[PDB]
Amino acid sequence: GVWKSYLYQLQQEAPHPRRITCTCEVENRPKYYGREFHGMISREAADQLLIVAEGSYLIRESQRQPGTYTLALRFGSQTRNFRLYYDGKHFVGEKRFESIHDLVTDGLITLYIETKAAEYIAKMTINPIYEHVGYTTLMPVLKETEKIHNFKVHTFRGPHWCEYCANFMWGLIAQGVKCADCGLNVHKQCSKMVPNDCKPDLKHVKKVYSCDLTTLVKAHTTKRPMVVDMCIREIESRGLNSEGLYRVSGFSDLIEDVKMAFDRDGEKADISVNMYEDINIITGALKLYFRDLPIPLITYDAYPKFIESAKIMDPDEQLETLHEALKLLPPAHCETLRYLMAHLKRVTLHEKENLMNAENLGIVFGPTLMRSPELDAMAALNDIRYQRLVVELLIKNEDILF
Template sequence: MRKNVRCFGSLSKISSLVRRAALTHNDNHFNYEKTHNFKVHTFRGPHWCEYCANFMWGLIAQGVRCSDCGLNVHKQCSKHVPNDCQPDLKRIKKVYCCDLTTLVKAHNTQRPMVVDICIREIEARGLKSEGLYRVSGFTEHIEDVKMAFDRDGEKADISANIYPDINIITGALKLYFRDLPIPVITYDTYPKFIEAAKISNADERLEAVHDVLMLLPPAHYETLRYLMIHLKKVTMNEKDNFMNAENLGIVFGPTLMRSPEDSTLTTLHDMRYQKLIVQILIENEDVLF
């Protein structure tokens, strides 16, 4: 009888979690706000602030310009400008190493197009590939894919005709995540995820992971959600690819999460918790997302 009560309690918690996740997702995760990336700028000729409409005085460093959208304002005015940056594709020089939200807004997509394109290719021809994501492709070929995305954007050709080894595509996707200036699991949320991973009770740990997920910026949340759905498909082919959630956690833990502290000791200490977080996200993607 006691076992049945515990079981009912767990199901009730998970049902509650699903309902809350759906509500919170609808409320918070389609408003892709982005702060401006202001840098001090020297303007040639007369210039007016695009926030207060007053003249910018001086000969040098008269104001600041957003390097993503080109908005020109006084330095003091920049503190009051709303988070409404709309990046201009002409100003976004790269796909890799570009802030995730900036890339998403520049291309007007829910997720970085490189993630969508790579995952489509992997699911089309690689889900049964042994050691998928664990086996590495040739570094120079992965760099070729990176350059193709940087050069051609969504027109980059990563088909089997050009790259027959699927491990090159998985390597390019992992490299994209590693090259992000702010990881998919952001520096702000990293310590909260690590603390959640340390909770011994499985139900409470799941609740804690869900609560931290809701703190991710919308573009990061959506990218993580899409990736976890994909990785769940990878585990469904485990009998062919030999990649379960734990194995994928080992691969993607340090790929998606980086400690804000630049400390080798911290990194080594956190590795098992990084693995566990990704494992939990994969195994519970239908509940957490």
């Protein structure tokens, strides 16, 4: 869908810090460094202690400038040295950390991503989404249609994506910049590309759509997304007898208005029969919701296992492997999925009027609830059959797997 997984997957692949412990009492060791501290050793010395594995790190005293300390880090099958500074927080550059462990964590993520995806990152910004996706005020949709923004460095709790170039904002802290006036979230370098179209009223509107599932759940402290509960309640309320439920789609324009309704009003959004007469609008907004999730309902880390289950012939091991896939999911994705499949089970019971069995429902939802994490999207297309059958299996046997 819209938000790009590449740089998010890379962050997951980044190697973790490996403190090389100096089993050593060292004279004039600063009380703020710990077991990683090695004092004044040679670089050959640092090289020999770091070679053991990727992400190994130590702190040592500089021979060129004594009384000053250097973080020595193993990455790319070689030793990278950074000058350390400390004033209550640890830092090598602009970013200020509470722990070296954290600093080194952000360090290795940066090295990994910036080195592996250099070209990609260089070019993330051609064909941006900014002027096409999102909101503005004339609250309307930009796609329907001068103040310099005010970007400050920001630390995002929970994974967030850049609203200019649509790519993941990587790192452990200060992964991007946020506008203090309107609230727009982008990359430092993307910040210089965003037009002077700041609309400060946009701060007031806390978004629901396109927000990380787990992040959103914790922010509101409710079991599942309010969009999921309300649409589901609305659908089952006016009836599951409607023909082509979830396969038929309402007007694009009004589905986006429902999405805008959720992003502006939240729990007080009006999705009644009075306001939107066509249930296909609500089904489309619910579908859309899942399709705006940065990480899809069935996570990228769970995808292979789910696809594996759908390849197996034995109905028992298939159901056993599929059950094992549900464990690979996070708690929020999992209870969101559980509720959805229970709803889709109820809709299939009314097959005689709505004509929507598990298979054809599985035609609609497979691709929505699943994306392959593979770079080649056209190649990833071969999986559609198995994405389709997974949801199908999840619907039928929902009653036992949950």
